[PDB]
């Protein structure tokens, strides 16, 4: 009736059921498994030429209104049975059906909830909602989106939220944003062969210049908002300055650090995923939470396909770069981490470190368990990219599913977009 | 026909068919990804009561008899003939067959050329095998493995070998090996409930106990080998103490280390899981390999579970040990890893560091795809448990699936046996 799961490092037993109202979209059988593919076809939701069949909506509206009333600590069979009905007609006498304000509110949480890859989950129900629904232009969405990016800001004391644009239609008047997030730095072919800023984001860029942008060709330039709105060929649109926070790089012993001239936005939001529930589409609902350091010292810093600093930072701490058995590495990335998380603290920047993040995620866990027999959770995501099993959910045995609402990727606007203009 | 394999740090692509071989028994569906457990009843070959049947004998035969001829450089169709005949027939008049010397030999290694979990398989090749199949006596199996130990062991020059002792029977004359390493040290639970040891081999340790093994009550005591030989009740043997090679741990710039009084053994081996080939089951067959410092650093020293010394380490290093957010505990893993990889060198025993691990890995996952279209990979157990995305294994995508002949987990000898005396 379930899967039993156990945690090697204290012991303990969960048993899931909640497995069992997960759609099957996963590609793994029992000849292989393909849980490490980086962006799998089964959790991205391509672009659409015709409108949802009411006849394959209807259920799934149904569904997800149940969800939303069972939620209620209180039955409320009247309402909820009337909601049911009028769900019903609309979607005849429309062809599909809108969500109450209160409903899109439970919607964007439970997604986050239901989101395997996500860390933070603990503080799913710390969600600001902003109500783009009846957003018309790309102007318009600008708005919108600067509004979102001053809130959660809120100079260095993060907050959480997502921005929700119209629902999907006929897959022709789409509203959304190509760029993968919403604040991210150019990458830029110079003609000596050589790349300046960051390298995994060469092609973006590129694109922005071919779209009229001009290049500053700078090591930290933030590139603008590509911004699709109404199906209608993208605009291009600048975030101000002023509402993009930075964070300049110290460490708290080594003084050369600064030397490096080092810097990253504090608001990480993913800006390209489509929210779906009770079979409606969202192709635009950027999103954002606060960072987590390995995120930045790990990944932005030491990948060798991003800024790749690790071997400076190996040279002035004096240490033997020649030789791998020395662990210079694992040495220099730890002080890296060590300068990302004072550096945000001492500029007062919310951050978190992965063992607080591991051990949060672990309370989360337990409770989602006890709460609804379940918790969907992707190791491979969740592990943090540096001093892994020194952490708890190292030693988590965990079930990976796709429930209902969900936060799905999508392919890059780009690559389908038919050009009017 | 194919699957896309990509490594994201280098953009490198491959292209996987070798899945198509794979036995269908992975426990992951399209409802939910099983990807993460630990020992999954998918990969546990189970005891038996009856010798199995030549149906499915037969066709698993000649399979591997085919994969066997199909290795050779130079085709030898009349002897690939001859051998599909005898033993076609030779499982006719006897239930069951026997495989050559050679066969052995190509089966072990093709074995570990197929461990998903095995991140030092470049190797593979280089195996010798010691071929135990006439054994009767479990004092023979005792001689058989220290000779195994003192020959892998070379004073420090570790070399790859197994010990393969007679296939599996009716089920009830099982030859095997009950520790699961060869070697190990105890577990001690105390009069007041404190635990003296590796509290993880508490419950092997007791029953070596319960059989007559007399406890030292030591931080470092090698248990004694618990060897069954023909489904007998199993007999302990210890191994002489000059047949293992220890290390005493120090650090090349804090004095202090050596005060924690650490050691450990130098040669790592598995002891017991199942070897399969052809249909036929060898549940006594140890190997060894040489170290991958993180195990001992990250896994044994560090583990909560464990050792646990990360605090007290932290502690003499000075560190602030009350904020997780100065990673101490990564400063302090890193210290007791370089402490491994020094000691172990500056005694000259055989040791591997997890970059250059992960590097040779890349060349032979390279070479696999070149050779056969294919290579089973488990993306969670190939990660080192430190530094992750700081080695290149980290980026690439994998996909994982059994193959034969392969090595499987068994269910721990002492649950299920039927004790005689
Ligand atoms: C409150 C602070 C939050 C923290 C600390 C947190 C942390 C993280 C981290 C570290 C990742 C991994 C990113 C990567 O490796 O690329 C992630 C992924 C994700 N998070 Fe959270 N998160 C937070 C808030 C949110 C919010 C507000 C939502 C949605 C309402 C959300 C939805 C997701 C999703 C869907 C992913 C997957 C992204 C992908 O697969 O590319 N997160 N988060
Ligand atoms: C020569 C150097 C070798 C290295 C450096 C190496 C390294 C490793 C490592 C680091 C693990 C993970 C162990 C764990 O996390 O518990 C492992 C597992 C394994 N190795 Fe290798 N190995 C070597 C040789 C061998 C040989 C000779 C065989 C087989 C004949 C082999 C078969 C396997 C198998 C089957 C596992 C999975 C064990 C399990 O699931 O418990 N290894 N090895
Ligand atoms: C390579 C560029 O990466 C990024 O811009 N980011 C890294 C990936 C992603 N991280 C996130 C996202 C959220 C919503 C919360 C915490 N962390 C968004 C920010
Ligand atoms: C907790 C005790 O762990 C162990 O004794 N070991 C850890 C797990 C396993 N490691 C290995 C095995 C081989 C064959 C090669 C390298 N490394 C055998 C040794
Ligand atoms: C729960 C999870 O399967 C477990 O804690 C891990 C993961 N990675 C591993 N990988 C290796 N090399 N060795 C292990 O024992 C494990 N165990
Ligand atoms: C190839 C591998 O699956 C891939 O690089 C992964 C692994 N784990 C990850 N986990 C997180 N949190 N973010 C990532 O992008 C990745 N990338
Ligand atoms: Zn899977």
New interface residues.
């Given amino acids: 009736r379930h899967?039993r799961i156990?945690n090697?490092?204290?012991g303990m037993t969960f048993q899931d059921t909640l497995?069992?109202k997960?759609?099957?979209?996963?590609?793994?059988?029992?000849?292989?498994?393909?849980?490490?593919?980086?962006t799998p076809k089964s959790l991205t939701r391509g672009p659409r030429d015709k409108p949802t069949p009411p006849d394959e909506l209807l259920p799934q509206a149904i569904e997800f209104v149940n969800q939303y009333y069972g939620s209620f600590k209180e039955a409320k069979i009247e309402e909820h049975l009337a909601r049911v009905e009028a769900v019903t007609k609309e979607i005849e006498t429309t062809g599909t059906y809108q969500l109450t304000g209160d409903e899109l509110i439970f919607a964007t949480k439970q997604a986050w909830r239901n989101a395997p890859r996500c860390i933070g989950r603990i503080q799913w129900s710390n969600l600001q909602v902003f109500d783009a629904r009846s957003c018309s232009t790309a102007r318009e969405m600008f708005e919108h989106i600067c509004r979102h990016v001053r809130y959660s800001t809120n100079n260095g004391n993060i907050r959480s939220a997502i921005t929700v644009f119209p629902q999907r239609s006929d897959g022709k008047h789409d509203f959304r944003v190509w760029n993968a997030q919403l604040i991210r730095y150019a990458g830029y072919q110079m003609p000596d062969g050589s790349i300046r800023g960051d390298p995994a984001n060469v092609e973006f860029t590129q694109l922005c210049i071919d779209l009229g942008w001009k290049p500053k060709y700078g090591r930290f330039d933030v590139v603008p908002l590509v911004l699709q709105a109404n199906g209608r060929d993208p605009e291009l649109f600048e975030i101000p300055p002023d509402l993009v926070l930075e964070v300049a790089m110290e460490h708290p012993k080594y003084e050369w650090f600064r030397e490096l001239e080092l810097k990253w936005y504090a608001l990480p939001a993913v800006a390209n995923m489509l929210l779906e529930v009770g079979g409606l589409e969202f192709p635009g609902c950027p999103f954002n939470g606060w960072y987590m350091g390995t995120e930045i010292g790990?990944?932005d810093f030491?990948?060798?396909?991003r800024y790749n600093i690790?071997e400076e930072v190996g040279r002035r701490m004096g240490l033997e770069t020649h030789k791998?058995?020395?662990?210079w590495?694992?040495?220099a990335?730890?002080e890296i981490?060590?300068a990302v998380?004072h550096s945000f603290?001492k500029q007062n920047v919310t951050i978190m470190?992965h063992?607080?993040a591991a051990?949060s995620f672990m309370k989360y866990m337990q409770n989602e368990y006890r709460s609804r027999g379940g918790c969907p959770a992707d190791?491979?995501w969740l592990?943090?990219?540096?001093?892994?099993?020194?952490t708890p959910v190292?030693?988590q045995?965990?079930?990976?599913?796709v429930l209902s609402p969900f936060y799905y990727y999508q392919v890059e606007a780009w690559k389908t977009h038919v050009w009017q203009d």
Avoid at 23 to 31: E, N, P, V
Wanted: overall charge positive; glycine content about 6%.
């Fill in positions: 899967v156990k090697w490092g204290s497995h069992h997960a759609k099957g979209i996963l590609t793994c059988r029992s000849k292989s498994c393909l849980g490490s593919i980086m790990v990944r030491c990948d060798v396909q690790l791998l058995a020395s662990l590495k694992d040495q990335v730890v981490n060590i998380l603290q470190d063992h607080s051990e190791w491979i592990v943090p990219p540096m001093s892994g099993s020194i190292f030693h045995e965990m079930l990976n599913y």
